[PDB]
Design a protein around this ligand. Structure first.
Ligand SMILES: [K+]
Ligand SMILES: [K+]
Ligand SMILES: [K+]
Ligand SMILES: [K+]
Ligand SMILES: [Mg+2]
Ligand SMILES: [Mg+2]
Ligand SMILES: [Mg+2]
Ligand SMILES: [Mg+2]
Ligand SMILES: [Mg+2]
Ligand SMILES: [Mg+2]
Ligand SMILES: [Mg+2]
Ligand SMILES: [Mg+2]
Ligand SMILES: [Mg+2]
Ligand SMILES: [Mg+2]
Ligand SMILES: [Mg+2]
Ligand SMILES: [Mg+2]
Ligand SMILES: [Mg+2]
Ligand SMILES: [Mg+2]
Ligand SMILES: [Mg+2]
Ligand SMILES: [Mg+2]
Ligand SMILES: [Mg+2]
Ligand SMILES: [Mg+2]
Ligand SMILES: [Mg+2]
Ligand SMILES: [Mg+2]
Ligand SMILES: [Mg+2]
Ligand SMILES: [Mg+2]
Ligand SMILES: [Mg+2]
Lengths: 101, 118, 565, 128, 50, 49, 327, 132
RNA sequence: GACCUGGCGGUGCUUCAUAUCCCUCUAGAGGAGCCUGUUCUGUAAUCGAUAAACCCCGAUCAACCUCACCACCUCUUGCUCAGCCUAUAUACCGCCAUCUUCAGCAAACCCUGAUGAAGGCUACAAAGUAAGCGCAAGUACCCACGUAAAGACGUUAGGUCAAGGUGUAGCCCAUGAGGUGGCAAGAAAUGGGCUACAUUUUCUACCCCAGAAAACUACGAUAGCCCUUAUGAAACUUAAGGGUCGAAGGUGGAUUUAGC
RNA sequence: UUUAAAUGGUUGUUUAUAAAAAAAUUUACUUAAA
């Protein structure tokens, strides 16, 4: 019942990334320093690379929650510029008015 | 349809005396009810050769956060009931210099009141 | 803040279209709102998934879905305890049987908990959202079967069984079980003894003296077993003593005197039972007079807390006696007690509240000055209750006695707003009072406007779907009120209605129609008055016709008049 | 998605295409014009596909002087309600399909010789 | 209630942001929105916990 | 959670408590396409093979 | 018969307020006025229209920029538009001999003025502005053309130019309104005295985003201190120092006053311009009124309104446009 | 030409309410906001969740009271409370209104885990500001 | 044949255009390098915009993801009481461009033309009265100024089925869904921008009273090469810094943009 | 009165009506008996 298959793929990525966040944080800490031996850091390099691809947080996309538009989204409202304007121009967003100065 | 359509009763502001206890009508914060507020208040930008819209079915008056439950009479009556909960500031600590001598440490904390489920 | 008299109760929607306009609408509008809440709750519990996202901080347990199904599927004693906590009578009994067949041990406490569930609900499922006369106890019930199955039976097991039987009207069987309890040398608890008192009175139809001896014997058994009586022990005795109304009066007072000595403080229920016992259909009410006065002196300025399930029934009974004695000062004391502290919460359900206020306002109108009656009228209606059509008649009678008939038009307006527009009794009373005597011009005009509105109500009757009736009196009164106010045109139309509906006009209406015609000096109209009465064969017409013939009558009309008779 | 659903007024305004560039300069023919159909006409509040009987909405609040409880129409009973609803729609639709016999003037598609009825009455109680 | 209160008005904050006016192309055309946050600072003094 | 919103409002429609004007619109269109012959084919047993 | 779809109740349905309706609205205002006094705990008998407006503003707080859109509780006479009474009776005969002209009020007035001129002929300023058109229409409760207004004013001028009697002058004054002429005279600052008894005058200035406060002492040696620093150090650029000298040089009082100023915000030039304004306004206290007028006419006492212009979307700058491509 | 939320002039027979008669450039000059919460104030959180809730509530109420609403909702949030102010018509029976108020208040409180109230104002017919 | 209305005229007269049509004023573009679009060519390898009114345009943004593309592989009541970024913007809603740096569009009536398409003004007045909409007035920003905003009816079947929704037609073991990998280049041309060609300059101090530099070690790359770092699971590629390197360029053809 | 200033593929323009309807409740405690 999500807007489209693209939104559904992003929903799964956000879920898998959440599940693996702690494990990914722990392994990255082993890699992001010069204290530990390079042999150990090399094994950590492989371990984080073997985790499922959809656990990688960089693959998450901030799509419009209403229409799934991948660009033109305002992060504070999580809405596309077209949907945000529809709500703002009808006076349905608290405190948001047209700017003239 | 056996009977005629149900007819709305006349507004109960016509039964209100001009010396009523208004705080009893609006005890707490409530939306503006044109049938309960005995004021001919009008709102709305008037059309050419027109007048601001009447209060019945007026969505602009419904949008205002009114202060009908916080009239000067109600506030004074409210605070009279709340004096029992208050304690008296120590008379010795008249000035800020006196406060610093007896209480050198000052702890600042902040509380945030927002609207929402959390 | 205080109650707003112009408003209906706060539970209702504060809107002219949605505000209840009658006592019936008051009940139905709340029932509809409650039905909506049940439908929502039904959906919430049917589909918990949709209401499992908790966004509240702090967490609100009450706004979460409820799960009524057992989540332990293993057959064990611990898993059985769940079904008893869930009050699944059928599931628990079936599982208990399966547990017993498997041969695992069920603790006495667990078995006793099952008996409590079975005994209280009579081996019947408690009511759920969705899937009177006679003895509900059945010989082939699960409680009895399990009771025998029990290997060890403690005092609590017998107790809950006795209480169950009495609750379900198995009085004789409960008494037999108590005899078995005594044979086992097992002490009964206070709650069992309270149930047993009820059993002895209800079981047999012996005369009072025998029943009193039995009750006293149980009290002596209670003392022998070192069982201390609670408030309910005495309240049941008084409630049981209501059957023998004239013989239990003095004994009932002895029971009350015993309570005070022991230290048990009589609650509102205790006094409710007493006044009901002492207040039977008798004209003197001499004993009742003393009791109520003494009770009110004791209860003056006492804040009450819920102690007995019957605490809510005192005020309606107290006000009923005040109306019977016709003592307004006593009624004000009863109401004063209701208004002290939080005693107002003991008024009871809606039908109790309507009765209390009906009896209270009917006594005010009768026994108090009109100026104060109108103050009570404004405070109580509509904010406290919606008046019955009979209470408006009492208020009209009070206005008559006080010679304040300028308010009658207002009473009609309020009556229409309270759902009495089409009450025949009320409409006939108002018209009769307005037309009984002549009034000054200003009052006569106002009465005509009210009469025209009452007339319009008769025309637009919803009973028309069945049959439309114009009571003879109403028609006569309306016509007279139009004639006295000077709307002769409107009155002239009413003569068509009299013959149409076959209603005989009174002589006073005909005699006064003369002046209207004489002032006009239209002999044609004068004959119309004669023509109508002649149809009904009224004796006044013949003598009347001659006087009209002397005053104003056309020669040709005179001859016709005589032949028409 | 529940959040992508529009109202009936918006759906019909788009589907009908009454305001466009194809209706300005004789750019479109008149045959394929479609008509608006109000889909709320025969719908009753509280009536659904499951057939639940909500006391005080779908059914009367009180029956025999007692508040009714939530009930559900049996399978066969709901089938009748659903079949009746289909029949009611077809009848309503039939009424619209019926053509009223229009008295023709000089020719079938000609306006000449067709009566326009009585002249409209004047503003001061004048009648023709 | 006997409290010592002093009121002053901190300066308002206006947040402005720009959006595209058309659904597709026409970059030169923009709609600009604002949110105005006004303030009032009520400063009580010499109070007790109760 | 678009599942919760969609599934809740679909259940409330089948219960008779929510009128979905949009879903009503696409149910009338889908109904007129059956009378016109533009019906969705059986899965697997399609035009192609 | 082919039935023309009949018109519904006129949609426009222009609202007319009959005199009885206005009377019912007045009763409502008077009754509402007593509740509003009761709500606010004031005397019903001394509750004025300015108290009503204050109470309504508190009870119904509206931030709408346009005041005509805010909640209002005014006397119906001030709310509802003034409507002309019925001009004909039951018989149908109009009440005015000039009714059929359509402008009985206007043409009756024109007739009166012409008559007065005839009688006057047979018998023989700065503050007041001729009543404007929109305000004359209000008096007559008639809709006039611009050329009709001209005609009427021309006739009044003819009346005024000729000699008039007591009565004719009063009639003319009915159509003359009062103009309050603002004085372009500088407001002098109040000379203060410090702890030592030395006269000084504080003033303020503003230029772009800079704001200066200057204290000019009645007597001094010509010392200027900017933010506690000698002016030649704080203003190395000669142009800035030239601006500081312009106020004192123009009144020929270089070396006769000591100034202490504080300037914050803006750039070097804006700060010098802000200080120039602050010093000039403060120095007005010690110069003569005529010298103050010369200072005003020389540009030394006007706040320069030229501030930076915002940038507009779709353009390179405030006025600069993006490169235009015909093809 | 601008289109956003503008009812366009017709032949003078289209009744418009006061809300729909004002274009977006009047949202803080002649008309107010249909929702009041703190999400969009400076330094305030959860503007996104407040917005989604508003969009749902407006659709829920439109379908729950089909054909009854005479104008747009006014959504009010004070602390934990949510108050829905609806101007409805006087066509549906009062019994059905009371059922729907009890049903919607309960169902919405369990959905958004907060006390929800519904304040109905009845009008005989849609309030016409002007005929466009 | 004769007319009505509009358009158009290298059509007359008169008055004008205020960043404006000409004469004028200032700084630029067109030449060079680089950055970024577009067209062509190339590639197994998206789509849309594309006189004024496209060309740092949908994107307030593409290493995977985004993605809609290509190759290969896999799934079949499928996240959904399915799905489709499949065709049709010449079926539409929605949101807009444009004249508009306009002032007109007008329902309802009345009158003129012999009751034709149509037309309706003269103030010392001769048939027009006109609701509504736009302009205006108000409001936002620092004023009554200015700038924003606003800007009707229509014109270009103007832009957008790929924001989303949707009429009609089509696919349903595939025109739907998922996985892995991969393409997004430069023969060439061209739009916009950035940095320069220097002495009103370059470097350092300072933030305006200085000392040096100043033509093959000058001015001049934000490019190339190497190294390091930042983000990331992934960087020859994205960004930042350092080193190294020191090129074209010597003020630019026809032509052309913006500013009161 | 007064320089020169050519071109623009084919077919695609304007008629018959208009509009739903409803609904039942049916004003007054407690108890109790056989
Ligand atoms: K022409
Ligand atoms: K150049
Ligand atoms: K489509
Ligand atoms: K360039
Ligand atoms: Mg990303
Ligand atoms: Mg034919
Ligand atoms: Mg610039
Ligand atoms: Mg624009
Ligand atoms: Mg170049
Ligand atoms: Mg391309
Ligand atoms: Mg293309
Ligand atoms: Mg990619
Ligand atoms: Mg890929
Ligand atoms: Mg595809
Ligand atoms: Mg198009
Ligand atoms: Mg295209
Ligand atoms: Mg301006
Ligand atoms: Mg603009
Ligand atoms: Mg304007
Ligand atoms: Mg096109
Ligand atoms: Mg595919
Ligand atoms: Mg350089
Ligand atoms: Mg480099
Ligand atoms: Mg790294
Ligand atoms: Mg060099
Ligand atoms: Mg050729
Ligand atoms: Mg051609």
């Amino acid at each position: 019942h999500y807007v489209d298959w693209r939104m559904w793929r992003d929903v799964k990525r956000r879920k898998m990334a959440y599940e693996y966040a702690d494990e990914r944080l722990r392994i990255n800490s082993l890699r992001k320093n010069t204290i530990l031996p390079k042999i150990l850091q090399d094994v950590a390099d492989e371990e984080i690379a073997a985790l499922p691809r959809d656990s990688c947080p960089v693959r998450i996309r901030n799509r419009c929650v209403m229409t799934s538009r991948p660009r033109g989204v305002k992060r504070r409202w999580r809405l596309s510029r077209i949907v945000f304007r529809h709500l703002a121009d009808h006076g349905q967003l608290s405190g948001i008015q047209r700017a003239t100065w | 349809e056996r009977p005629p359509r149900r007819k709305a009763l006349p507004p109960r502001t016509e039964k209100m005396a001009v010396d009523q206890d208004w705080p009893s009508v609006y005890p707490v914060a409530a939306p503006f009810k044109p049938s309960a507020v005995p004021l001919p208040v009008r709102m709305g930008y008037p059309v050419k050769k027109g007048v601001p819209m009447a209060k019945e079915g007026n969505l602009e008056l419904l949008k205002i956060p009114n202060f009908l439950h916080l009239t000067p009479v109600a506030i004074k009556k409210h605070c009279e009931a709340l004096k029992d909960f208050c304690t008296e500031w120590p008379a010795a600590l008249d000035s800020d210099e006196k406060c610093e001598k007896h209480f050198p440490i000052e702890i600042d904390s902040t509380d945030y009141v927002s609207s929402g489920p959390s | 803040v205080n109650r707003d008299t112009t408003a209906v109760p706060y539970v209702f929607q504060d809107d002219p279209y949605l505000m209840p306009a009658s006592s019936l609408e008051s009940r139905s509008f709340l029932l509809a709102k409650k039905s909506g809440e049940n439908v929502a709750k039904f959906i919430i519990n049917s589909y918990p998934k949709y209401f499992q996202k908790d966004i509240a901080e702090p967490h609100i347990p009450c706004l979460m879905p409820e799960y009524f199904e057992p989540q332990i599927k293993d057959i064990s004693e611990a898993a059985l305890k769940e079904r008893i906590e869930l009050r699944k009578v059928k599931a628990s009994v079936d599982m208990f049987d399966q547990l017993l067949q498997a041969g695992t041990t069920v603790s006495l406490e667990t078995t006793n908990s099952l008996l409590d569930l079975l005994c209280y609900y009579g081996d019947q499922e408690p009511s759920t959202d969705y899937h009177q006369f006679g003895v509900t106890w059945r010989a082939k019930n699960n409680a009895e079967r399990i009771f025998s199955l029990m290997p060890e039976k403690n005092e609590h097991s017998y107790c809950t069984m006795i209480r169950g039987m009495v609750k379900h009207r198995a009085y004789e069987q409960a008494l037999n079980l108590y005899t078995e309890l005594l044979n086992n040398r097992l002490h009964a608890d206070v709650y069992t003894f309270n149930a047993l008192i009820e059993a002895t009175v209800c079981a047999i139809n012996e005369k009072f003296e025998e029943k009193w001896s039995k009750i006293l014997e149980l009290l002596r058994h209670m003392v022998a077993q070192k069982v201390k009586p609670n408030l309910q022990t005495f309240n049941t005795i008084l409630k049981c003593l209501r059957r023998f109304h004239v013989f239990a009066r003095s004994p009932a007072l002895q029971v009350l005197r015993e309570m005070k000595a022991i230290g048990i403080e009589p609650s509102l229920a205790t006094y409710h039972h007493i006044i009901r016992l002492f207040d039977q259909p008798g004209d003197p009410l001499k004993r009742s007079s003393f009791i109520i006065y003494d009770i009110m002196n004791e209860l003056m300025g006492k804040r009450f807390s819920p102690k007995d399930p019957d605490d809510d029934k005192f005020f309606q009974s107290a006000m009923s006696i005040c109306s019977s004695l016709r003592d307004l000062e006593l009624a004000y004391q009863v109401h004063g007690l209701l208004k002290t502290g939080d005693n107002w919460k003991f008024i009871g359900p809606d039908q109790h509240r309507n009765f209390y206020y009906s009896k209270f306002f009917d006594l005010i109108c009768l026994m108090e000055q009109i100026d104060v009656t109108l103050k009570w009228y404004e405070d109580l209606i509509p904010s406290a209750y919606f008046p019955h059509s009979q209470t408006m008649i009492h208020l009209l009678q009070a206005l008559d006695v006080a010679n304040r008939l300028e308010v009658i038009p207002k009473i009609w307006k309020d009556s229409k707003e309270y759902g009495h527009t089409f009450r025949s009794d009320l409409r006939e009373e108002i018209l009769m009072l307005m037309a009984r005597d002549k009034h000054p011009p200003e009052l006569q005009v106002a009465f005509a406007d009210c009469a025209a509105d009452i007339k319009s109500a008769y025309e637009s009757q919803p009973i028309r779907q069945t049959a439309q009736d114009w009571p003879a009196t109403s028609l006569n009164c309306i016509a007279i009120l139009f004639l006295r106010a000077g709307r002769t045109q409107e009155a002239w139309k009413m003569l068509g209605l009299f013959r149409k509906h076959n209603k005989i006009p009174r002589s006073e209406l005909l005699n006064e129609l003369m002046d209207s015609a004489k002032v006009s000096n239209s002999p044609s109209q004068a004959i119309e008055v004669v023509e109508l009465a002649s149809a009904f064969s009224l004796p006044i017409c013949e003598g009347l016709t001659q006087r009209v013939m002397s005053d104003f009558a056309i020669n040709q009309e005179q001859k016709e008049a005589l032949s028409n008779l | 998605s529940f959040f992508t659903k529009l109202t009936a007024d918006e759906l019909w305004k788009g589907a009908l295409a009454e305001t466009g560039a194809g209706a300005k300069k004789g750019r479109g023919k008149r045959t394929k014009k479609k008509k608006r159909k109000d889909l709320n006409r025969g719908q009753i509040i509280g009536e659904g596909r499951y057939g639940f009987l909500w006391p005080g909405l779908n059914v009367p609040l009180m029956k025999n002087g007692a508040v009714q409880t939530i009930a559900q129409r049996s399978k066969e009973e709901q089938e009748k309600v659903e079949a009746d609803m289909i029949q009611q729609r077809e009848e309503w639709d039939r009424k619209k399909k019926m053509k009223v016999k229009r008295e023709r003037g000089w020719s079938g598609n000609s306006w000449g010789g067709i009566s326009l009825g009585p002249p409209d009455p004047g503003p001061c109680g004048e009648t023709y | 209630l006997g409290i010592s209160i002093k009121v002053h008005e901190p300066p308002r904050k206006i947040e402005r942001f720009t959006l595209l006016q058309s659904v597709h192309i026409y970059k030169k055309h923009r709609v600009q929105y604002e949110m105005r946050t006004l303030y009032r600072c009520l400063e009580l003094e010499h109070l007790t916990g109760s | 959670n678009h599942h919760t919103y969609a599934e809740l409002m679909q259940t409330l429609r089948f219960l008779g408590l929510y009128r979905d004007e949009h879903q009503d619109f696409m149910d009338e269109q889908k109904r007129l396409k059956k009378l016109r012959g533009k019906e969705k084919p059986k899965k697997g047993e399609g035009k192609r093979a | 018969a082919f039935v023309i779809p009949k018109k519904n109740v006129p949609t426009s349905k222009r609202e007319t307020y009959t005199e009885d309706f206005i009377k019912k609205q007045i009763e409502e205002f008077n009754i509402g006025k007593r509740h509003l006094a009761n709500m606010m705990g004031e005397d019903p008998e001394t509750f004025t229209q300015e108290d009503i407006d204050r109470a309504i503003a508190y009870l119904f707080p509206s931030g709408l920029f346009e005041k005509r859109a805010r909640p209002v509780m005014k006397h119906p006479e001030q709310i509802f538009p003034r409507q002309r009474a019925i001009q004909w009776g039951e018989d149908g005969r109009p009440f005015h001999y000039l009714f059929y002209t359509g402008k009985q009020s206007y043409y009756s007035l024109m007739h009166d003025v012409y008559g007065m001129l005839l009688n006057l002929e047979k018998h023989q300023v700065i503050g007041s502005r001729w009543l404007i058109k929109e305000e004359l229409e209000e008096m007559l409760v008639e809709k006039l053309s611009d050329l009709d207004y001209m005609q009427f004013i021309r006739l009044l001028e003819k009346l005024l130019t000729s000699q008039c009697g007591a009565a004719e002058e009063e009639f003319v004054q009915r159509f003359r309104r009062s103009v309050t002429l603002e004085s372009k005279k500088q407001l002098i600052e109040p000379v203060q005295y410090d702890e030592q008894g030395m006269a000084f005058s504080k003033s303020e200035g503003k230029r772009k985003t800079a704001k200066a406060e200057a204290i000019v002492y009645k007597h001094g040696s010509g010392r200027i201190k900017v933010n506690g620093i000698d002016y030649q150090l704080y203003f190395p650029i000669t142009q800035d120092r030239e601006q500081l000298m312009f106020p004192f040089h123009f009144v020929d009082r270089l070396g006769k006053h000591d100034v202490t100023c504080t300037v914050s915000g803006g750039g070097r030039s804006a700060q010098a311009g802000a200080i120039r304004l602050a010093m000039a306004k403060a120095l007005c206290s010690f110069v003569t009124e005529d010298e103050v007028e010369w200072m005003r006419q020389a540009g030394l006492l006007t706040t320069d309104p030229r501030v930076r212009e915002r940038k507009k979307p779709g353009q390179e700058g405030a006025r600069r446009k993006f490169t235009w491509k015909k093809r | 030409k601008n289109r956003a939320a503008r009812v366009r002039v017709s032949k003078g027979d289209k009744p418009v309410t006061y809300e729909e008669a004002h274009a977006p450039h009047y949202i803080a000059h002649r008309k107010g906001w249909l929702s009041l919460h703190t999400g969009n104030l400076d330094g305030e959180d959860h503007a996104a969740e407040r917005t989604v809730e508003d969009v749902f509530l407006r659709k829920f109420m439109w379908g729950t009271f089909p054909g009854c609403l005479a104008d747009q909702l006014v959504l009010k949030r004070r602390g934990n409370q949510l108050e829905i102010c609806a101007v409805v018509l006087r066509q549906l029976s009062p019994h059905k209104y009371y059922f729907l108020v009890g049903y919607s208040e309960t169902l919405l409180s369990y959905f958004y885990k907060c006390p929800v109230r519904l304040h109905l104002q009845t009008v005989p017919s849609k309030v016409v500001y002007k005929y466009l």
